[PDB]
């Protein structure tokens, strides 16, 4: 249920302060988590039920990031985006 998903966007769609016409493929992690598989989450879930414990469980998040993305803004200056986009996803 925790999957990678890709969308084709303008760099301005990211809202990071840039005034450009350059573009990218942005990738992200979506979905819900298994609720188990670590000992830690088994304990969080169990402690919650017997109420001897809202903050706890895992999240579908990036485990790898894409390559740096470069672009020339409208004012003839280059910029580099680092770890802007995800390569793989896991529940962590």
């Amino acid at each position: 249920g925790c999957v990678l998903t890709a969308i084709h966007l303008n760099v301005t769609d990211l809202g990071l302060g840039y005034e450009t016409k350059e573009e990218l493929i942005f990738r992200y992690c979506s979905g819900s988590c298994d609720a188990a598989e670590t000992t830690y989450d088994k304990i969080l879930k169990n402690l919650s039920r017997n109420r001897r414990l809202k903050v706890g469980q895992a999240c579908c998040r990036p485990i790898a990031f894409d390559d740096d993305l470069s672009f020339l803004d409208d004012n003839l200056v280059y910029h580099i985006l680092r770890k802007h986009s995800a390569k793989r996803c896991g529940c962590i």
Partner: protein, 199 residues
């Protein structure tokens, strides 16, 4: 409507290969966060890697794109990050620089190639053959990242030059000009760049 040079940048960012190596040269070549000084050698190294690892289709779009206005030409001129890869305090004499290039295998190999492939078809016919266009473009692009890194020098033409002038030529003045004009006024090179952006 936009740009052909901007059209090229989108194609490069949407291609996993081109995008990777573009960023790999921008990194060591770009300043402008402070003014500072780049590592010319890392920049040159990254630049050579860009044109050798990325297919001509994507790597030429960036460099040989056609332009309709002066803004487009400025984008095209910033391709190689000239503040870092190109300009220096002063310009040396061109023949001096030619000598310096011939002492570096990489540059010597590339300059020879340029002079071989980017010359007239015959003894009167100014332009080279059309099926020789690709190999001339390969040779000019190949000079980028050497001490003989060239770039476009104005807004109203496809004239290019390295960072050298012909001051202090003496009796060698005509040969220096002959060398510099082989970049500035190359009929085959202009025509190859004109044919790439068909029209």
């Amino acid at each position: 409507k936009g740009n052909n040079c901007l059209d090229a940048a989108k194609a490069c960012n949407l291609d996993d290969t081109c995008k990777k190596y573009r960023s790999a040269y921008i990194t060591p070549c770009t300043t402008s966060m402070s003014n500072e000084v780049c590592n010319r050698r890392k920049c040159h190294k990254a630049l050579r890697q860009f044109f050798d690892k990325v297919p001509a289709k994507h790597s030429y779009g960036m460099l040989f794109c056609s332009c309709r206005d002066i803004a487009c030409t400025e984008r095209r001129r910033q391709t190689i990050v000239p503040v870092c890869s190109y300009e220096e305090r002063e310009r040396p004499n061109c023949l001096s620089l030619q000598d310096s290039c011939k002492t570096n295998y990489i540059c010597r190999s590339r300059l020879a190639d340029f002079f071989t492939n980017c010359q007239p078809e015959s003894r009167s016919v100014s332009n080279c053959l059309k099926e020789n266009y690709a190999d001339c473009l390969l040779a000019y692009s190949g000079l980028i990242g050497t001490v003989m890194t060239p770039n476009y020098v104005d807004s109203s033409s496809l004239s290019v030059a390295p960072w050298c002038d012909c001051s202090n030529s003496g009796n060698d003045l005509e040969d220096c000009l002959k060398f510099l004009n082989f970049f500035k006024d190359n009929t085959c090179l202009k025509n190859a760049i004109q044919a790439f952006g068909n029209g």
